Design a protein around this ligand. Sequence first.
Ligand SMILES: CCc1c(C(=O)N2CCNCC2)[nH]c(C)c1C(C)=O
Ligand SMILES: [Mg+2]
Length: 104
Amino acid sequence: MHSDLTFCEIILMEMESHDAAWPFLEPVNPRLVSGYRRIIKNPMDFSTMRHRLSRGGYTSSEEFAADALLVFDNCQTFNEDDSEVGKAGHIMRRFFESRWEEFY
Ligand SMILES: CCc1c(C(=O)N2CCNCC2)[nH]c(C)c1C(C)=O
Ligand SMILES: [Mg+2]
């Protein structure tokens, strides 16, 4: 588990500092985004994952991956692939997938 969570801290650090991370560093404000609340049932973002890691809320690295993948599933559900947020989400999703795979 210490091995699991060490990897999680590395990959989240790397995602938080990525150029394409800007749509995911804070929760979407649904008051500012028409339709977000109706369409996205389980919002997720990097600061929520950071907060959860800080309070010890992740037991395994599979839990952590489920949150990361939820970020990018939400992104592809709500944003067009050719939108600014959609393009950034594909960059971040490919980064995470490839980085997760050269560990496990
Ligand atoms: C276009 C709105 C949007 C942002 C976004 O612009 N920001 C993230 C929140 N903090 C400020 C910047 N991020 C996402 C994942 C979305 C949507 C609708 O999926
Ligand atoms: Mg693949």
